[PDB]
Design a protein around this nucleic acid. Structure first.
Lengths: 75, 49, 64
RNA sequence: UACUACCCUUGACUUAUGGUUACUCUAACCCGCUGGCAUAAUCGGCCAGGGAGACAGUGUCUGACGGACAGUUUGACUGGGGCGGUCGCCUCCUAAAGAGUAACGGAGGCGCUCAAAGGUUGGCUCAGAUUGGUUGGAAAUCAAUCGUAGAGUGUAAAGGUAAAAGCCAGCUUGACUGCGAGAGCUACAACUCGAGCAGGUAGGAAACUAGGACUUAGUGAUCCGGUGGUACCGCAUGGAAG
RNA sequence: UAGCGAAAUUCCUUGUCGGGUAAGUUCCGACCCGCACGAAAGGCGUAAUGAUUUGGGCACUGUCUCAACGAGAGACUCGGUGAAAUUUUAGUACCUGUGAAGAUGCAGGUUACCCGCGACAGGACGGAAAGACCCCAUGGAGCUUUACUGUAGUUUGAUAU
RNA sequence: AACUGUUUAUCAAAAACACAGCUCUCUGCUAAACCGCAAGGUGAUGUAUAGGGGGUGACGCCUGCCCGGUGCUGGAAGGU
RNA sequence: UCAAUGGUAGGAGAGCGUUCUUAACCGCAAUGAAGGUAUACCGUGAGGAGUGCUGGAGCGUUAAGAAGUGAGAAUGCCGGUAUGAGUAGCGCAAGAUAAGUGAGAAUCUUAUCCACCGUAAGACUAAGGUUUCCAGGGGAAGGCUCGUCCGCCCUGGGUUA
RNA sequence: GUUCGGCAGUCAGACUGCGAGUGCUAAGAUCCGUAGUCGAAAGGGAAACAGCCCAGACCAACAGCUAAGGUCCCAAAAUAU
RNA sequence: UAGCGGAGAAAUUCCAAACGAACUGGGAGAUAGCUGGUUCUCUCCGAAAUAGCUUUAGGGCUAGCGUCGAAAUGUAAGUGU
RNA sequence: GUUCGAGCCCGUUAAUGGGUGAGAGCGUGCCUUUUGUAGAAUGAACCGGCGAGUUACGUUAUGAUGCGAGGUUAAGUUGAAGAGACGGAGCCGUAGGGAAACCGAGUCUGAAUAGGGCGACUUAGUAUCAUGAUGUAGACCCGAAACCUAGUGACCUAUCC
RNA sequence: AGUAGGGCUGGACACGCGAAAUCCAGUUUGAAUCCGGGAGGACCAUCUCCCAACCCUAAAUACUCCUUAGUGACCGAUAG
RNA sequence: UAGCUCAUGUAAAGGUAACGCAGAGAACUGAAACAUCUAAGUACCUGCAGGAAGAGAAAGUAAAAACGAUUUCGUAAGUAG
C-alpha cells in the first residue's frame, strides 16, 4: 500500500473582484482561511474569515500599516 | 434515475397529511359581475344560468 | 390507458402555477446534533427546485 | 377492653371450588387382536368376546432442530484477473504564479474536546541564550542581562498570529430567538458566509462587542419508530382512536 | 504410540552412500535431516493372482546403421459414372522497407515467352470449430455450508375429539 | 490392488468400484428404516445370528494418546 | 453586387419514386395497355419519358389523401445456378470363352470349364418385413455405371388344416 | 451573447509538440494541464504516412499565380549565380 | 420402475444414433446494461470522447460540448486587441 | 481503374458519334467496430423474392384551423358500419397562498402590521387536427443459455420379475 | 342459533395486520331475538338507513365452431 | 338388518368452437440485483352450466332531505387510497 489514497478535497481560494468594482453591500470579496489581506471600512471579516463588503463602492487596495488591506471607498 | 443513487424526490421528507373534508366554492372574479348587470339575487342560478 | 400519476411522488412535490415547485429541506428529519446552530436557524425553511436539473418532471408528476 | 361488636394481621376447617398430579374404570376411540356371519373372500363390513384405553390418532396454533430439499445472496477499483490495500471528510505538495485537478502519487490525519480553551471587560508578553547564586541536573526554582516571537496558539498540517488568535484575572452564559437583504461555491443535493432589522438580552461606566473555539477534520439522504408541545384534521355526528 | 520412510508422501535437493550400470537425475538396498509419514480417511507385512506401473536381463529381431527388393488396392492413362466442404470479385511473383505496429494487391527495386500437366506443402494469420484457456455480464445452471430466508419432515405444549 | 467380477457405450479398465471379511451403531414388532397427502405397501409370512446405516476391505501383526471444543447419548439442580 | 457551399454520430428544412386510393380532372388501349428488352436523350439527384422489339390485357394520368412504402450487406431466409471437378469415390471376394438374345450386350440367358464358402457364404425357423413370390409384358425414373435383366414398372395369378 | 422551449448524442479517444507526474527522467508506456492535428478535413511535401509541415475541396474549365517543399534522370522547374 | 424423477459394482454413468438435470406443447415474440442488422433523394448547420454521482467503471443521470424555434436583444453582455 | 491517347472497326433518343483499345500518368474493394483497419478484424458464393421504427390509449412540445374568458359534448341515441342532428353528464381555462384549519388579490412563514416566500404586478386560452418525443402494450427487430406447468417415454440402456 | 359475535390462524376487499373497517373461510367459544338486531372504516353516545343469518328472478352483457345475407383505401400464389 | 335376486325409468354415463362460473393454481419477468410486492390468482389443470352464464331485490349507500334490486358503458380519475 501507500497510505496515500488518503485524499484532500481542494476548494476555491483567492479573489472575487479585486479591482474597484461596485460590489454589492454584503457581498463576498476574498476567500480566506488565513488572512493575507486585512480589512477596512464597509468591509467585514467573515465567520469563514474572508472579507465581505457592507456598502457598495470602489474596493481598491491599500498599503496601510506596511501591510495589505481592503476597504471600500464609496462611489 | 440517479444512476442507482436515490433520486431527488426519493430524498424528500413526507410532508403534510390531507383533509378528507377539504371543500371549496369554485371562486369567480367580480369581473363577471362587470359582465352582468345587475342580475338581482346574484346566486348559483345567476352563475350557471 | 391513462398515464398513471405517481401518488407518492405527488407526496414528494408541490408545484405552483406560472412558476416552479416547492421543495422541502434535506437533512431535516433524522439527527440534529452535528448540524450547526445556524443550520438549525435557517434549514427549517427551504428553497425551490433547480433549473437545469429536474426536467425529469416529464411526466412522472403529471397533473396533481 | 362486660351488651351489639360495623372488625382487622397468622393458622385451622364446613362450603364455592379451581388449574391439580397420580391412580382406577370403560361407554368414547383403537387393535395390519381372537373367533363367527355372508364372502365362496387373507381387503372391507357386521356380530360375539379379549386387549388397550380416555391415552392414541386426527384437526388448529405453538415451541424444537432442520441442506432432507429449494429461493436468493455473495461489491467496486486493479497496470489481465486474483492477493493485498482502498472506498468517508480536513490540511500541504503534485497544480503548471486566478481557480481546476489528474495515479494503487507524496505527507498527514480526523472520525474530538471545551459551561469554559466560548463571549465580554481589564491587564501581561514568549521561547530561548548568557551570568551569578545552598541541596543542583542539561532544564527544576530564583534574580539579572540579551531576547519579534528563533514560543504559544485544546487537539496533525497549512495559512494566520504582538491593536494579538498568544498569557492571566473579573463579569460571564449570545455556543440568543425570529430572521435575513446581499452574496460566494456549483449537475443536483448540498456547502461557504452574511450587511441590516426586530424581540429582548449579556457583558462593558459608556461607547463598543456578542448568532461558538485563531479558520479549516471531529460527519452522513429519505423512510420507519420514539420524545415533548401543537390555535390542525379528526371520516353522519360528537368525542376518542389515529 | 507401534510400525514404515526419499513413500503414488521430501520441489525442499539429481539428500547421502552402496549395489545394477563403462557409461546411470530414473531402478533397488540401506541410511531417515520425516516442510508434510502414519494407525481403521486402516499402518506395516503378505505367497498365488494382474491386458498393472517400472527397473534389469535372456531370447528373437529391419525398430535402426541404412536401407533395398518384389505382391495387391488406390493413386495415375483412358471409357462410363459422377459429389462434398469452399468463397468481396481478382489475368493473385520476389526482395527491402512502410503501415492497427508481421504484405499479393502499397512505395522503391528485381527478375517473368503464353497455357498446362504429375506430385509436394511454406504462405494465402487455409478450412471445418461466434475459444471449450483467460476475462466480463448486477447472466444462468449445478454443488457445498455453523450465509439469510424458508419449506417438508422430526419432536413439545395447548385444545375439540 | 488380494483374486475372479464390475467400470464411463459416443476416450480413460485402473491402484476406481465392488467383494467375502472385519468393525461400530440403530431396531423388540402393526418393527426400525423406507415409499406414498393419506390409504396402502415394502422391510419379511422377517423376528436382534434378522433388518437398517457408517467405516474398512482376505490372511498375518497391530490399532497408541487426548472428552478441551463439536456432534451424539443420558441426567436433572438452577438460568432461558 | 457581396459573402457562404469539407463534413461522420447530431439536428432542421425540402423533394423524388411505389401501391392503394369509387372520388374527380380524363385519357389511353389491339393500329397494342401493362410488363420485358436494346437504346449513342433529358433531369443538380432520386428520376422522367422517346424509339426498336417481345407481348397480348389493363394501365397511365394530374392534384390530394391513406400507407405492410422506398433494399446489399444480418451464418438473414427461401428458390435457382456455380465452384472444386471431370477430381474423389464407384460401398471388403475372380471368373472365363463360345453360342444365343436383341437394335443395342461385359454386366441378360444357356453351354462348358474355373473359382469360393461349406459349425456356412448351406436348410429351416422366430421376431420382423408386409406381397417384396411367381407368370407374362415393358424399360419414365431406380439399380451407384451399362442394361433386353431385376426385390424397378404394368398386368395376372399365387398361401387350402 | 442571454432567456425560454423542443430535440440530441458524446463518457473510452489518441498523436504531435510544450510544461508536469509515475516509470530504468525505458518506451508508438501511463496520467495530467496546455495548443494543434486526426478522428470527423481531401490536395501537396517528406519513398508509401490518420496524427508532422503546408494548405480547408459547390462545380466546370486545355487559365494564371503561389504555400511549404523542391529544380542531374525517373520526376517538373537552376548541370543557376 | 418416468424427470422436484428413475436406475445405478457410482464416473456426475445412463434413461430410444442423446442428459449435472430428458423430450413434446403452452406460458412466452421469457429475458438479455451484450452481438449483428437496417434499405428514396437533396440542401443547410454542426459534436463529444470531459466534470460530479452511481453494486459504477465496455452503462446510465445531470452539467460542458450541436441543432432548430421563440422572446427580447442583461441595452449590450459575447469575442478579440 | 480513370485521364490522355497511337491505331483499328462501325455509323447513333443526330448527336463536339459509338465500339474498341496498344501505350502512358496517377490511382489500398465494400460493410460493422475502432483511437486508428486496405487488411493477415469480421462478414458477404451468386442471382431474384421476402425481410424490420408501427399503431391502441395517454402526456408534452410545436405549428395549422376554429372560436374566444368562453371553449367543450363524452358515453349514448338517431341514422346507410352514412352524415348531420340530438344528448352538457362531465372536462379544460377563468386568482392563489399555505400541510391543514383557513384566509384571500393577497396569502403563508414568522410576536411582527419587519423581512422573506410564493403570488394579479407576473396579461388567454379552449377544442380539434398534424408532427416530433413520451409512456403501457414482445413496442425497431434478430438473438440465448434459462424458468415453470401439462403431457409422452424402459424395445437404447440400468434395475427387477 | 352454533347464528351474529369473541379468541387464534388465514384470505379477499385499493387494503402488504394496520387505527384498521366490512365480508368469507378453518378452529374454538357462544348470544339476544321486536322494548329486538345490524351498518354508518378502531371504538363510546346521538342521529340516518336497513331487517341478514331461507330460495328463485327475464332484460340490457361476453363469445363464435356454426347457418346464410354479405362488406372491404383486405391479399394476390414466399402473399393470402 | 346387512347382503342377495328380479322388475321399471337413457336417467347417464359420452363427443364438445368460444364465452362463463367454481375449485386447484405457478413460474419467468419487473422492481436496474433481490427476500416484501409485481407479474396474476394470470399460464396450466379439473369440474360444473347455458345461450349466455353468473347477476340481483338493501340486515344498501350516503350525510343532507339522500336515495331506493341488479347489470353494461361513460364519468368521477389514477380521484380517494
Amino acid at each position: 500500500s501507500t497510505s496515500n489514497g488518503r485524499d484532500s478535497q481542494a476548494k476555491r481560494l483567492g479573489a472575487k473582484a479585486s479591482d474597484g468594482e461596485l460590489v454589492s453591500g454584503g457581498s463576498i470579496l476574498f476567500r480566506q482561511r488565513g488572512t493575507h489581506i486585512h480589512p477596512g471600512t464597509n468591509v467585514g471579516r467573515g465567520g469563514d474569515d474572508t472579507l465581505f463588503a457592507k456598502i457598495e463602492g470602489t474596493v481598491k487596495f491599500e498599503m496601510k500599516r506596511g501591510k495589505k488591506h481592503v476597504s471600500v471607498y464609496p462611489v | 434515475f440517479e444512476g442507482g443513487q436515490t433520486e431527488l424526490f426519493r430524498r424528500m421528507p413526507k410532508r403534510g397529511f390531507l383533509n378528507v373534508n377539504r371543500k371549496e366554492y369554485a371562486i369567480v372574479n367580480l369581473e363577471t359581475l362587470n359582465r352582468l348587470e345587475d342580475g338581482a339575487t346574484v346566486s348559483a342560478e345567476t352563475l350557471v344560468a | 390507458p391513462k398515464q398513471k400519476t405517481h401518488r407518492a411522488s405527488a407526496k414528494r412535490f408541490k408545484r405552483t402555477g406560472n412558476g416552479g415547485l416547492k421543495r422541502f429541506r434535506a437533512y431535516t428529519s433524522h439527527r440534529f446534533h452535528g448540524k450547526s446552530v445556524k443550520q438549525r436557524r435557517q434549514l427549517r425553511k427551504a428553497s425551490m427546485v433547480s433549473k437545469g436539473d429536474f426536467k425529469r418532471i416529464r411526466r412522472m408528476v403529471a397533473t396533481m
